Design a protein around this ligand. Structure first.
Ligand SMILES: *[C@@H]1O[C@H](CO)[C@@H](O)[C@H](O)[C@H]1NC(C)=O
Length: 160
């Protein structure tokens, strides 16, 4: 009951996302009991902006850097934004996104290589970063869901 097994024995509890190769690209596959909800590496839930919150069109460089996804670059409202056209500076088009659909690829603990979700609640104490609670060895970790302590599933974060 609950959770879903995939890959080669990697079961990810419901409401749990995890990156996986679906041919020749990365895909966002999350377990929800009723089945894994895979979603190609599509843009983020854009909104507002001078593009009707439509979809983005990256990679899109700005200020001198090449952004592959949404970014708060120059954003003073908090949310992020993404170019709504291959040639951003060209059509000066863009669109705001939500928490740049953050996606952490954690592994270890009790999530077995699970796409750590951020933010993540820990002991009714909301969190937003690979916290080292209970660990004394350089191995920052986070919750595989919006409520780690609520699902009892954690995972180690990347090297950086
Ligand atoms: C964590 O944040 C969410 C949304 O901000 C809120 O609904 C939830 O109650 C918070 N958790 C705690 C323990 O305050």
């Amino acid at each position: 009951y609950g959770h879903c097994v995939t890959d080669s024995g990697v079961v990810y509890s419901v409401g749990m996302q995890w990156l996986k190769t679906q041919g020749n690209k990365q895909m966002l596959c999350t377990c929800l009991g009723n089945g894994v909800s895979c979603q190609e590496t599509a843009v983020t839930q854009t909104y507002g902006g001078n593009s009707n919150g439509e979809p983005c069109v990256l990679p899109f460089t700005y200020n001198g850097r090449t952004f592959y996804s949404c970014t708060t670059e120059g954003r003073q409202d908090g949310h992020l934004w993404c170019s709504t056209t291959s040639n951003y500076e060209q059509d000066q088009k863009y669109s705001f996104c939500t928490d740049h659909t953050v996606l952490v690829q954690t592994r270890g603990g009790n999530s077995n290589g699970a796409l750590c979700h951020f933010p993540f609640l820990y002991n009714n104490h909301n969190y937003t970063d690979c916290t080292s609670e209970g660990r004394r060895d350089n191995m920052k970790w986070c919750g595989t869901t919006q409520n780690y302590d609520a699902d009892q599933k954690f995972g180690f974060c990347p090297m950086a």
